[PDB]
């Protein structure tokens, strides 16, 4: 009994009791959150998929809301005195999938 | 035996043939045989 | 290029001579007399056989 949820312009194969990591959602720490973009459900249970299954949904607890590891964005043009350094901590939110 | 890039019948009993993908000229007068068309 | 002739260690190869003849097979002294002079030093092992030609 898994599913495929469309969350942030990306699909995710999700089973229960699993912790998942998604782009930033507006909710705060420790909250429920219902996924509606579910395109395909069921493993050993059933195999039903439409553009969106439209009968099934998912519910997750908003476990945490943070920022990934700072990747430094460095790059340069050789012999032409041009270089550029940036930083980036892409923000994420981690969720526990409570029910399907 | 003439080996030149233009074989054409000289006297009216010389006949053009092919052999091994080469254009030959068989002829009774033995001067008149040619190949490499 | 490989095969360029350069200084290095010389001699010691397994060389073969051919078409020698047998002047005399001295039995009871157990020697053979061959026409010529064969590879190897004195006391050097030599294997004699019949010509391949």
């Amino acid at each position: 009994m898994f599913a495929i949820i469309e969350t942030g312009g990306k699909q995710i194969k999700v089973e229960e009791g699993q912790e998942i990591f998604v782009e930033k959602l507006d909710v705060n720490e420790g909250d429920t959150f219902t996924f509606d973009k579910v395109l395909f459900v069921g493993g050993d249970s059933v195999k039903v998929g439409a553009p969106t299954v439209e009968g099934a949904t998912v519910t997750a607890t908003v476990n945490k809301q943070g920022r990934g590891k700072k990747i430094t964005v460095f790059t340069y043009k050789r012999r032409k005195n041009s270089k550029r350094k940036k930083g980036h901590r892409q923000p994420y939110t981690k969720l526990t999938i409570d029910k399907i | 035996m003439k080996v030149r890039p233009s074989v054409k019948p000289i006297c009216e009993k010389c006949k053009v043939i092919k052999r091994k993908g080469k254009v030959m000229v068989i002829c009774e007068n033995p001067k008149h045989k040619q190949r490499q068309g | 290029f490989k095969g360029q002739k350069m200084p290095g260690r010389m001699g010691g190869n397994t060389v073969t001579v051919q078409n020698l003849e047998v002047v005399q097979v001295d039995t009871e002294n157990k020697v053979i007399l061959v026409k010529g002079n064969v590879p190897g030093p004195k006391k050097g092992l030599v294997e004699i056989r019949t010509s391949i030609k």
Binding site: I12, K13, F21 | - | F1, K2, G3
Partner: protein
Amino acid sequence: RQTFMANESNIERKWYVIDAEGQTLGRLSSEVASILRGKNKVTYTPHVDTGDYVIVINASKIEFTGNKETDKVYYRHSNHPGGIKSITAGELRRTNPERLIENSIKGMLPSTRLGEKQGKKLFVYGGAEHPHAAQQPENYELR
């Protein structure tokens, strides 16, 4: 995220045996190289050989097309000055067919450290008898 990668304990490997009678050399070699690298199976990952072991038999019976027996000179250089060697496919088919098919297939696998592992999973015999009875080889037909 989630993308299954093949490990040493995930992988399986199977034994196939393909008649090389009546097949064009390259039309068969492509199929065989596909099998060797291992992308007939869904657990394909690049950094490991999830492919199979293959036993090509009847290598003294492959067919060329057109004037390729007398043409199609195989060359090889000995790295000595001026020493280049040659052999036509007709003379390599009667003298050593098990090198004909091997060279065809191994030119279609990558030249890497893992491509040589896969390169030495090919077992080519000129004949109908292969000594790998103890391996449970399977039939295989050209897809």
